[PDB]
Symmetry: C2
Subunit: 118 residues, 2 copies
């Protein structure tokens, strides 16, 4: 007969406090020191937040040339993360596909840079 652990549920506050924004990639280059292939990006999160640095394991489905102009979703309120010689400011969000390759989170149509996910 079944037994169970505690609820994994959260309050709205514990969701809201995670600041996820949409922004547009303005620069993309290879990330030479990455353990697994990656691309370093600069993302324009709009006039208030500004342009922020990030990286992602996204060389399978994407290229530096095709990424410029793509809107991505990122967590903007982590402390900076030192990734080898690169100091990342934002965590860029994605999903593993059927093969384990990274597919970016997106918006169904473009929206203003800097909008919060809700």
């Amino acid at each position: 007969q079944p037994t169970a652990a505690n609820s994994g549920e959260i309050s709205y506050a514990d969701f809201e406090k995670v600041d996820i924004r949409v922004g547009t990639i303005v620069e993309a280059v290879p990330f030479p020191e990455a353990r697994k292939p990656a691309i370093k990006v600069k993302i324009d999160f709009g006039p208030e937040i500004g342009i922020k640095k990030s990286s992602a394991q996204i060389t399978v489905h994407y290229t530096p040339e095709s990424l410029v102009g793509r809107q991505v979703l990122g967590v903007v309120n982590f402390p900076p993360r030192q990734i080898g010689p690169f100091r990342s400011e934002v965590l860029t969000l994605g999903f593993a596909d059927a093969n384990g390759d990274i597919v970016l989170a997106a918006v169904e149509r473009p929206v203003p840079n800097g909008e919060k996910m809700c």
Copy 2:
């Protein structure tokens, strides 16, 4: 204003596929989040850019770990995620290409 990775990990956001949509201004949907999570109900104010017909078959993102809540006879189970456009109307969060239902955003 800053959070930890642990704070982020507490939030369970998954991709799923809308399998049903009816008008509610709001639309009631059922979303298939795959074998572990199953079918979940949601209500979203997305009538400006979407219809039931354009919604069914679409993959959406949802917070799957809020408690279920009653809205009259309707049991709302997940928050369907989106962003305000230039006019304040909701545009859905999405995936750039198909992903298995139930994958976590990370």
